[PDB]
Amino acid sequence: TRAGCLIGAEHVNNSYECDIPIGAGICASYQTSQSIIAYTMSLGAENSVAYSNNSIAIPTNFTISVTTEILPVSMTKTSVDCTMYICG
Amino acid sequence: SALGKLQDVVNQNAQALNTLVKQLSSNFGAISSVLNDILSRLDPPEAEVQIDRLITGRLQSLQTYVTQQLIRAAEIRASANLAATKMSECVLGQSKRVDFCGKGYHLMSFPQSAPHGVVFLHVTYVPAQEKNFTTAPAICHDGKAHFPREGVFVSNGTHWFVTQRNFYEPQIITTDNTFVSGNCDVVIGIVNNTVYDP
Amino acid sequence: YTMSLGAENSVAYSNNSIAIPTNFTISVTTEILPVSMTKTSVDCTMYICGDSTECSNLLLQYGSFCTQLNRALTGIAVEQDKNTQEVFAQVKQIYKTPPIKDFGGFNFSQILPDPSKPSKRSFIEDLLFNKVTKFNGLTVLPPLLTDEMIAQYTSALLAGTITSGWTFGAGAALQIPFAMQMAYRFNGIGVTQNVLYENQKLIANQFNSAIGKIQDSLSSTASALGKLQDVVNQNAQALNTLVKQLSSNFGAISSVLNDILSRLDPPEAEVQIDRLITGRLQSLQTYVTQQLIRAAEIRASANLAATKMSECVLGQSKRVDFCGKGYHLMSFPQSAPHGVVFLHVTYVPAQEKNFTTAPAICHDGKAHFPREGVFVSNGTHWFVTQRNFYEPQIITTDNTFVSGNCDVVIGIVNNTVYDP
Amino acid sequence: DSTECSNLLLQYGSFCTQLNRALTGIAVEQDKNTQEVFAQVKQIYKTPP
Amino acid sequence: LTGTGVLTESNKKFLPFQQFGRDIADTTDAVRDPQTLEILDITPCSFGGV
Amino acid sequence: TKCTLKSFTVEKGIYQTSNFRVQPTESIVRFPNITNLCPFGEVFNATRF
Numbered sequence: 001t002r003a004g005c006l007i008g009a010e011h012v013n014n015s016y017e018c019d020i021p022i023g024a025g026i027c028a029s030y031q032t033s034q035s036i037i038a039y040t041m042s043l044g045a046e047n048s049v050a051y052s053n054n055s056i057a058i059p060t061n062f063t064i065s066v067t068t069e070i071l072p073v074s075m076t077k078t079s080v081d082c083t084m085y086i087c088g
Numbered sequence: 089s090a091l092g093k094l095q096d097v098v099n100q101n102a103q104a105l106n107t108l109v110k111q112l113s114s115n116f117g118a119i120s121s122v123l124n125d126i127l128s129r130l131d132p133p134e135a136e137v138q139i140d141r142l143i144t145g146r147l148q149s150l151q152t153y154v155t156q157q158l159i160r161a162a163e164i165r166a167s168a169n170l171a172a173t174k175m176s177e178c179v180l181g182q183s184k185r186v187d188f189c190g191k192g193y194h195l196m197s198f199p200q201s202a203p204h205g206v207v208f209l210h211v212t213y214v215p216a217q218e219k220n221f222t223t224a225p226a227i228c229h230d231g232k233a234h235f236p237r238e239g240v241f242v243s244n245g246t247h248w249f250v251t252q253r254n255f256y257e258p259q260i261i262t263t264d265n266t267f268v269s270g271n272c273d274v275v276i277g278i279v280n281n282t283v284y285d286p
Numbered sequence: 287y288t289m290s291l292g293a294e295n296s297v298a299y300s301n302n303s304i305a306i307p308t309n310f311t312i313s314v315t316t317e318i319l320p321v322s323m324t325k326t327s328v329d330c331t332m333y334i335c336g337d338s339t340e341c342s343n344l345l346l347q348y349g350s351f352c353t354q355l356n357r358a359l360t361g362i363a364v365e366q367d368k369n370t371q372e373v374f375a376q377v378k379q380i381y382k383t384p385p386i387k388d389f390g391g392f393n394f395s396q397i398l399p400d401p402s403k404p405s406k407r408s409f410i411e412d413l414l415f416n417k418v419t420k421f422n423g424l425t426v427l428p429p430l431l432t433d434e435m436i437a438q439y440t441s442a443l444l445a446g447t448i449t450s451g452w453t454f455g456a457g458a459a460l461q462i463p464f465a466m467q468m469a470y471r472f473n474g475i476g477v478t479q480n481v482l483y484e485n486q487k488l489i490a491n492q493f494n495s496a497i498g499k500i501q502d503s504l505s506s507t508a509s510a511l512g513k514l515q516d517v518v519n520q521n522a523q524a525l526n527t528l529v530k531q532l533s534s535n536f537g538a539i540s541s542v543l544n545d546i547l548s549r550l551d552p553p554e555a556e557v558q559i560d561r562l563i564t565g566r567l568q569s570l571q572t573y574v575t576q577q578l579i580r581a582a583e584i585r586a587s588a589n590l591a592a593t594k595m596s597e598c599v600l601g602q603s604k605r606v607d608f609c610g611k612g613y614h615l616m617s618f619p620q621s622a623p624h625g626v627v628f629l630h631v632t633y634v635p636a637q638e639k640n641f642t643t644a645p646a647i648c649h650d651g652k653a654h655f656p657r658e659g660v661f662v663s664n665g666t667h668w669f670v671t672q673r674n675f676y677e678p679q680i681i682t683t684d685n686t687f688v689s690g691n692c693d694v695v696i697g698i699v700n701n702t703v704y705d706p
Numbered sequence: 707d708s709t710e711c712s713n714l715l716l717q718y719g720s721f722c723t724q725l726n727r728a729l730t731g732i733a734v735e736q737d738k739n740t741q742e743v744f745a746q747v748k749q750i751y752k753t754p755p
Numbered sequence: 756l757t758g759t760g761v762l763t764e765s766n767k768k769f770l771p772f773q774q775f776g777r778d779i780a781d782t783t784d785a786v787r788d789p790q791t792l793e794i795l796d797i798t799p800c801s802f803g804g805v
Numbered sequence: 806t807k808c809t810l811k812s813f814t815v816e817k818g819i820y821q822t823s824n825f826r827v828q829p830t831e832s833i834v835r836f837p838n839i840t841n842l843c844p845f846g847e848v849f850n851a852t853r854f
């Protein structure tokens with residue numbers, strides 16, 4: 001590979017959504033006997049919108065979805081005693 | 089695996105505290121790591137030499153820990169400012185910022201408490217089950233163009249209709265949903281269609 | 287001499303004078319934003335002492351500082367990878383442009399990729415890539431997303447912005463002609479979409495001229511990509527200073543471990559070894575602190591760039607002076623070495639004209655206020671136009687709402703209102 | 707105002723050189739921050755009489 | 756000039772008055788063989804974190 | 806991996822454990838030719854003392 005060479009995993013010619021980032025696009029995953037494969041990661045699907053200046057796509061239905069996301073605000077506030085820490 | 093950021097912060101703080109307590113019990117190039125055995129089994133010169141060596145080592149370790157804590161506190165302050173502005177712009181009001189209050193059209197958000205963090209419940213409006221129609225920029229009936237006021241000129245093949253830009257709702261093309269400006273000789277894509285007068 | 291703060295303009299402010307523009311021009315401006323730095327990971331044990339077991343023993347006796355430095359470097363690399371992933375990979379479905387290019391009349395052959403290239407980039411991307419220009423334990427780990435993958439990400443973003451517009455980032459892809467998308471983007475800044483369908487050729491010509499001027503500026507001016515070049519130079523200088531720190535004795539007999547071990551007796555030898563080790567450890571600590579500060583700055587810049595992308599490329603934001611100077615219509619992201627380049631398409635009106643304004647008019651005693659217009663007049667007749675484009679229209683009751691009488695408003699003028 | 711101390715300090719590498727570089731960078735950062743915060747308009751206007 | 760690394764031939768030329776060469780950094784790039792007067796390049800053998 | 810992670814349960818992902826480095830085998834002594842030989846032959850094996 002570009003970051004070296006991978007010893008212990010076979011190199012396949014497939015392209016799936018990878019989970020373990022190896023490096024320089026290489027990705028490993030335990031997938032079928034089953035073993036660790038080494039394939040180039042994909043960027044999603046291969047959708048191709050048939051664009052034409054005569055048609056439009058207007059949605060008819062809608063699905064309400066509730067998405068969550070966490071965000072840290074504070075930490076554990078501490079205070080060390082230097083005289084006792086350095087010299088007990 | 090959803091609660092990752094808060095768990096990562098807690099684990100980082102715990103690892104920092106553990107490595108600090110471990111570095112306190114280091115040699116730093118001395119003969120031992122306890123001060124009593126050094127002051128009791130050495131002559132005063134070598135005793136104070138080892139003491140100042142351990143003091144320098146512990147001071148360097150504490151300074152490194154304080155620098156790491158300051159960097160982490162700056163990162164957490166940035167994240168907290170981001171969370172606060174997100175709270176203010178999503179919960180206290182509807183935001184038109186794309187991909188800010190969740191992926192999709194923002195509707196509402198519900199904050200939730202969390203240990204050393206905040207959890208949001210951004211309600212997103214995502215369309216689905218779309219269908220293609222035949223569109224056109226405008227129409228002209230009385231030799232003058234008719235651009236849509238607020239809507240999209242769609243057509244199921246035979247009859248033309250005007251609908252919202254985010255929901256299919258075919259309506260009769262009337263003069264209240266379109267405005268007249270100029271003739272239909274400059275715009276490209278003009279189609280011939282009649283308009284119903286109320 | 288004394289610096290000048292600019293020109294000295296004096297706006298002739300008046301209570302009955304307004305300036306409504308009659309023309310406009312599309313100006314495409316660039317905005318360089320760093321996304322990630324080079325992934326570096328220096329080995330503490332190899333950098334402090336090379337080929338010496340006594341050095342390793344003494345270093346493991348000093349504590350676990352090398353483990354802390356390795357963990358910090360791994361965290362920095364993971365943060366850079368996460369920033370690179372969150373900046374570019376905004377859409378989970380790669381789109382492709384159709385073979386026929388009839389996008390309203392615009393020329394998009396300067397930013398879309400061409401098959402006659404092994405890297406699958408564009409002309410502007412190639413110019414940006416051509417503009418920007420192991421030893422004792424340090425290594426440069428390659429990034430996760432390669433240049434081709436970032437190019438494909440940018441290509442999918444351009445395809446979604448051209449064909450679908452902004453719905454590709456807020457749900458499924460909804461195809462829409464480029465003329466209708468431009469009209470809907472114009473109808474979100476104040477100006478009515480009727481001016482685009484009547485001046486589409488002029489807008490396309492101005493957009494092509496702006497693209498050509500941007501290409502000429504990127505090809506001629508070598509100091510355009512200043513932020514990325516400065517970041518690369520700073521990283522290179524930091525690495526060079528870190529490497530050159532080994533040629534220092536730090537108050538010892540020499541700077542080579544083997545020379546001290548073969549010339550000095552074991553106690554003095556280990557004394558000089560401790561001196562060199564603590565010196566190199568302080569050097570590596572300062573280097574790691576500076577790298578962490580720079581990585582925090584780069585992460586802040588990458589978060590800003592990701593927000594700008596998600597708010598201007600995947601949609602339209604009315605934030606003033608956030609995406610190009612002027613009314614933001616659209617933007618196009620472009621790949622860059624360790625950076626991103628946004629092609630902010632702005633709406634800048636020009637060629638204004640003085641007009642006499644008024645708050646409202648009352649025809650039969652009841653005041654008539656404009657819905658979304660302004661009561662301008664050329665001295666004789668009164669007309670209502672838009673707020674960002676001059677368009678004289680007859681003052682009718684279909685565009686003006688009546689509320690109360692003209693007895694309290696200051697600035698009332700008598701005028702007739704045509705009734706359809 | 708010492709030469710022997712200067713030599714003994716230069717024997718410790720180029721630390722304070724990097725410190726001076728960082729100080730110059732901080733100064734330039736403050737300058738450009740003030741410029742981007744206050745000097746946003748490219749034409750000074752005047753209030754009417 | 757002690758050290759370790761792979762000793763291979765290079766393409767650079769040395770005038771018959773110089774000695775071991777350096778690089779942009781403070782490491783020994785190339786050395787001049789004091790036996791056969793040949794130009795040798797010093798490259799550290801491959802190393803990396805597993 | 807379980808040793809450097811200090812845990813018997815290891816999840817998925819990449820994990821750095823140590824630093825691989827090729828070690829040398831033998832040494833090479835390079836020195837110029839022996840030309841300026843000290844005339845010791847005419848000292849010990851002299852014709853007159």
Ligand SMILES: *[C@@H]1O[C@H](CO)[C@@H](O)[C@H](O)[C@H]1NC(C)=O
Nearest residue numbers: 052053054055276277388390
């Ligand atoms: C799109 O625009 C071109 C411009 O010349 C025109 O010829 C064509 O009829 C339009 N419609 C389609 C479906 O291509």
Ligand SMILES: *[C@@H]1O[C@H](CO)[C@@H](O)[C@H](O)[C@H]1NC(C)=O
Nearest residue numbers: 060061062063064215216217
């Ligand atoms: C929209 O989809 C939902 C499923 O999420 C379904 O229950 C509903 O009937 C659909 N509405 C229409 C009008 O098809």
Ligand SMILES: *[C@@H]1O[C@H](CO)[C@@H](O)[C@H](O)[C@H]1NC(C)=O
Nearest residue numbers: 055219220221222243244245
């Ligand atoms: C929608 O797309 C399909 C795909 O070929 C096409 O046959 C059809 O004419 C388009 N328009 C409508 C109204 O279905």
Ligand SMILES: *[C@@H]1O[C@H](CO)[C@@H](O)[C@H](O)[C@H]1NC(C)=O
Nearest residue numbers: 243244245246247248249258
């Ligand atoms: C299209 O819409 C019109 C509107 O009434 C309807 O009569 C017709 O059945 C629809 N379908 C077709 C194929 O025209």
Ligand SMILES: *[C@@H]1O[C@H](CO)[C@@H](O)[C@H](O)[C@H]1NC(C)=O
Nearest residue numbers: 228231272277278279280281
């Ligand atoms: C629409 O009506 C005009 C007016 O007579 C005619 O010239 C034209 O051919 C018609 N069809 C179009 C524009 O497709």
Ligand SMILES: *[C@@H]1O[C@H](CO)[C@@H](O)[C@H](O)[C@H]1NC(C)=O
Nearest residue numbers: 308309310311488492636637
């Ligand atoms: C607006 O200015 C442009 C020059 O940028 C010019 O080509 C165009 O004709 C002008 N439009 C009007 C209506 O004057």
Ligand SMILES: *[C@@H]1O[C@H](CO)[C@@H](O)[C@H](O)[C@H]1NC(C)=O
Nearest residue numbers: 387392393394395396409498
């Ligand atoms: C678009 O621009 C390219 C180069 O910038 C040029 O070769 C081409 O003729 C232009 N027009 C079209 C329709 O591609």
Ligand SMILES: *[C@@H]1O[C@H](CO)[C@@H](O)[C@H](O)[C@H]1NC(C)=O
Nearest residue numbers: 297298305637638639640641
């Ligand atoms: C408007 O009036 C001002 C002062 O009365 C003058 O300087 C300016 O040239 C006039 N025209 C425009 C377009 O501002």
Ligand SMILES: *[C@@H]1O[C@H](CO)[C@@H](O)[C@H](O)[C@H]1NC(C)=O
Nearest residue numbers: 663664665666667668669678
């Ligand atoms: C003002 O505009 C109206 C509308 O076209 C025109 O009839 C009139 O002559 C104009 N007056 C002047 C003084 O330009």
Ligand SMILES: *[C@@H]1O[C@H](CO)[C@@H](O)[C@H](O)[C@H]1NC(C)=O
Nearest residue numbers: 300301302644645696697698
């Ligand atoms: C505008 O101000 C002038 C004072 O110079 C005053 O004479 C005039 O009546 C004012 N007009 C309005 C509409 O307030």
Ligand SMILES: *[C@@H]1O[C@H](CO)[C@@H](O)[C@H](O)[C@H]1NC(C)=O
Nearest residue numbers: 648649650651698699700701
């Ligand atoms: C406007 O008209 C009203 C009655 O129609 C009259 O009382 C008032 O004086 C008029 N004002 C002007 C400025 O002509």
Ligand SMILES: *[C@@H]1O[C@H](CO)[C@@H](O)[C@H](O)[C@H]1NC(C)=O
Nearest residue numbers: 789790791792837838839840
């Ligand atoms: C040393 O001796 C060898 C053996 O003949 C010869 O090839 C080489 O050139 C000599 N080098 C010098 C510097 O005299």
Ligand SMILES: *[C@@H]1O[C@H](CO)[C@@H](O)[C@H](O)[C@H]1NC(C)=O
Nearest residue numbers: 844845846847848849850851
């Ligand atoms: C003197 O001659 C003897 C006999 O050949 C020899 O062994 C010895 O090395 C010679 N002395 C020197 C200084 O070479």
